[PDB]
């Protein structure tokens, strides 16, 4: 293996930012990685480039092993979304490189092909249970299995939204049952709850919808405290999910133990990499845990065609987020996965297949925004 | 209460690298906070400079509980060195604005005083146990009450001052067997120098595995030292177990957790007695306080990280909270130079081994703005260890 020439960050908008990372050996071979932090990009960009980078100029780009402890135990400060998400973007970054030095696609390297095609699904939102079903017939059609359902509930800074708990309740199974009587069984329909529930009114609201068959009821609580799963998971057999704003195995090492969830949704650029998510896949598959990346459009192409090699390799393997990038960033990150039918197709070039134009990202200046945050409607800052 | 008008970070580095938040009101009054995270100073700079002081202008300052929930809530993304970091920075410059306002010492808005001083240890360290025994004494003349003791490992050339000493993180050797055969001598010898009074602290710094950490506890239990340190990594609470089953060696831990989270097991559980976790990287003053309250209904106590590298700020907020809380353990004193002291003018005293609080509004520390532009940030990390065989250890 070669050592590290030179290593940067590149930062561009095409229609939502996203940061870059980019590894080049001595070889002139080099690799890239996403370290996009929706809402705080400058965060990662200034720990990758004020204090990553440089260590990483003279070392063996094959040590993604060693990198990866040397960055995470090394930053003293273990874990955390800024920490993880600049280790990922190394991480992903060195993979690349091993796979193109190995002329093999990621998940020729990873194990090899578990499936002929990964599962997706997509987002259905609509103001009204009407204006969703329109969207779940149009996804349908494009030949998608699974949607992800929302709808209204009647009744550069972060957006202030207001949010009331008990309408949400007595409203939702409402779009479920409007769901099932107008597709039937065979479609995958999932739900994300957003961190809004206590676990007992997520424990009601797994409940009323057993006699829709959710394929999960995703992030009912927030879960600093795994504990908050237990009862939900004591009271109802619809599958759960959790974990998009996790970024450590010890975010969920106790969920996954103890079978509190069927998914989990810690994806590559925020959960440490390849390296680290692999360990994940492979504890929660002890457990009959399957993943479920998280995968909106605020991760870039990089880690989609990332984790689509990833996915096509691990054996337990649930489902694919599928969120279309603008035709812009698709530009700025030309990539060989493939969309068909419902489900992508990994790349066979040589790494995970995606690449940066330069050029092109120059033409798309940052531009800061952020998340919405969420209040009740007496004004307590809630969860989004 | 007042809207925030002004919001900015401020950094220098008189003698080492500091970052601080600064809040202006709209009367003028102002308020700062400690934002320093060593060795990852600028992704903290960035965090703030970026993301939360542009939301903070127009803010009312008064509502401190709603700006930490707004923060650690509306970043979607929770917890974390950076990110509470961030937070603490904030959280402290508020709460020094609500002091000043209500014309209070800090320590007097938390709930008063619980203890006329707050009792700090100092660093003792040698490459030899003879020269360390000779800083013990130089302390204990100072007035120290209590000591933390390290020792070179006879076959190691570095152990575990200012550890961020390098632009890019310094590469040191670690053999744990060796460490673990010679530590006993420099407690044995402290004991037998300097008798039972004495208050000895040691700092393992992460490098045991957890029943290494028992055979240590086990070994020095005749020295009844007042802690032993971070014996293990952490993330997995767990770790703590066998240790706790194993020896009655008080243990203390988290200088390097930055929420709840990372030790409300270890605390329920009664694996630990002092908690380490400081303001500064702790989620500040909003959060903190629910971390000593919860640790005071298992008898852990508050054994706050007092490094170089948490600035005055943090220093002089701590003392004020060291006064005030009940469940209070050690205060952890290692110097600031005196180009810190000078950047940071503060009221808090030292006085024969002991902290006082300061009486003046807020937590009693400001910052001289035209002082701390003379001391340009210098990039400096923290080291890696690494086993003899080369294996990427924890320094
Ligand atoms: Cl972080
Ligand atoms: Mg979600
Ligand atoms: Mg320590």
């Given at each position: 293996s070669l050592k590290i020439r030179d290593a940067y960050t590149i930062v561009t908008c095409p229609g939502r930012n996203f940061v870059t990372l980019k590894i080049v050996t001595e070889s002139g071979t080099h690799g890239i990685g996403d370290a996009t932090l929706n809402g705080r990009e400058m965060a990662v960009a200034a720990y990758l480039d004020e204090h990553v980078v440089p260590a990483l100029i003279g070392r063996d780009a094959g040590r993604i092993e060693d990198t990866w402890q040397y960055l995470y135990r090394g930053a003293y400060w273990r874990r955390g979304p800024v920490t993880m998400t600049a280790?990922?973007?190394?991480?992903?970054?060195?993979?690349?490189?091993?796979?193109?030095?190995?002329?093999?696609?990621?998940?020729?390297?990873?194990?090899?092909?578990?499936?002929?095609?990964?599962?997706?699904?997509?987002?259905?939102?609509?103001?009204?249970?009407?204006?969703?079903?329109?969207?779940?017939?149009?996804?349908?059609?494009?030949?998608?299995?699974?949607?992800?359902?929302?709808?209204?509930?009647?009744?550069?800074?972060?957006?202030?939204?207001?949010?009331?708990?008990?309408?949400?309740?007595?409203?939702?199974?409402?779009?479920?049952?409007?769901?099932?009587?107008?597709?039937?069984?065979?479609?995958?329909?999932?739900?994300?709850?957003?961190?809004?529930?206590?676990?007992?009114?997520?424990?009601?609201?797994?409940?009323?919808?057993?006699?829709?068959?959710?394929?999960?009821?995703?992030?009912?609580?927030?879960?600093?405290?795994?504990?908050?799963?237990?009862?939900?998971?004591?009271?109802?057999?619809?599958?759960?999910?959790?974990?998009?704003?996790?970024?450590?195995?010890?975010?969920?090492?106790?969920?996954?133990?103890?079978?509190?969830?069927?998914?989990?949704?810690?994806?590559?650029?925020?959960?440490?990499?390849?390296?680290?998510?692999?360990?994940?896949?492979?504890?929660?598959?002890?457990?009959h845990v399957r993943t479920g990346f998280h995968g909106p459009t605020d991760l870039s192409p990089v880690c989609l065609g990332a984790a689509i090699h990833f996915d096509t390799w691990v054996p337990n393997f649930g489902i694919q987020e599928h969120m279309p990038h603008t035709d812009e960033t698709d530009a700025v990150f030309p990539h060989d996965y493939r969309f068909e039918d419902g489900h992508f197709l990994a790349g066979e070039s040589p790494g995970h297949g995606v690449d940066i134009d330069e050029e092109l990202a120059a033409k798309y200046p940052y531009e800061r925004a952020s998340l919405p945050v969420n209040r009740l409607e007496d004004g307590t800052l809630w969860h989004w």
């Open positions: 280790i990922a973007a190394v991480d992903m970054a060195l993979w690349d490189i091993k796979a193109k030095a190995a002329g093999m696609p990621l998940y020729q390297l990873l194990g090899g092909k578990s499936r002929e095609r990964v599962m997706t699904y997509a987002h259905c939102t609509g103001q009204t249970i009407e204006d969703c079903l329109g969207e779940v017939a149009r996804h349908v059609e494009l030949g998608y299995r699974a949607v992800r359902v929302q709808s209204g509930v009647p009744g550069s800074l972060p957006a202030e939204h207001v949010w009331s708990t008990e309408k949400y309740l007595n409203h939702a199974p409402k779009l479920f049952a409007a769901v099932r009587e107008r597709f039937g069984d065979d479609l995958h329909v999932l739900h994300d709850v957003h961190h809004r529930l206590t676990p007992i009114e997520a424990a009601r609201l797994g409940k009323a919808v057993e006699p829709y068959h959710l394929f999960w009821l995703e992030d009912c609580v927030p879960a600093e405290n795994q504990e908050s799963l237990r009862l939900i998971r004591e009271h109802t057999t619809t599958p759960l999910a959790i974990g998009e704003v996790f970024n450590s195995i010890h975010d969920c090492r106790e969920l996954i133990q103890n079978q509190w969830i069927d998914y989990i949704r810690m994806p590559l650029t925020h959960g440490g990499g390849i390296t680290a998510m692999r360990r994940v896949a492979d504890l929660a598959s002890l457990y």
